[PDB]
Amino acid sequence: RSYTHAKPPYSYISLITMAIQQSPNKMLTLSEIYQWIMDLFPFYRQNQQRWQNSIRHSLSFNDCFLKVPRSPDKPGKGSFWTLHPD
DNA sequence: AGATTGTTTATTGAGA
DNA sequence: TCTCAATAAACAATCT
Ligand SMILES: [K+]
């Protein structure tokens, strides 16, 4: 049987920012961001289709998130995302 | 191909 | 009314 959780009081900027700040390298992949968010806020275990679309939109749309490429000799899926140094 | 990641554009909704 | 946040969606790049 399923259970209603209430949306926590954070914008996607805030959610992403917190995820990154917490990370030991100060950077996370997109899927790591998803993980951190879901692990912590069970509200986000539903409707993953739309809220993840929002996250992706946020990373690209907002200048405060910076794409870090993976090393040539350490390849993988997607880039890391860190905070713009502003 | 098939899915994930990323970008971009347009709309919509909420709150001041 | 107007800005900004969130949503929806089209389409490309890049992984599996
Ligand atoms: K960006």
Residue numbers in the entry: 153 to 238
Kindly provide excerpts from the paper associated with this entry.
Forkhead box H1 (FoxH1) is an essential maternal pioneer factor during embryonic development that binds to specific GG/GT-containing DNA target sequences. Most FOX proteins recognize the canonical forkhead DNA motif TRTTTRY (R = A/G, Y = C/T). In contrast, FoxH1 recognizes the TGTG(G/T)ATT sequences in several cis-regulatory elements, such as in Gsc, Eomes, Nodal, Mixl, and FoxA2, to confer activin regulation in vivo.
In contrast, FoxA2, also a pioneer factor that binds to canonical forkhead motifs, displayed the opposite behavior and selected only for DNAs with TT sites, even showing a decrease in its melting temperature in the presence of the GG site. Also, EMSA assays indicated that FoxA2 binds weakly to the TGTGGATT site whereas it interacts with high affinity with its forkhead site. These findings corroborate that FoxH1 and FoxA2 interact with TT sites, although the former has the distinct ability to recognize GK sites, a rare feature among FOX proteins. To explore the impact of the protein-DNA interactions on the DNA topology, we compared the DNA shapes of the FoxH1 complexes with other FOX structures available in the PDB and with the pair of complexes we determined here for FoxA2 using Curves+ 43. Small differences were detected at the major groove, whereas the minor grooves were found to be slightly wider in the FoxH1 complexes than in other FOX structures.
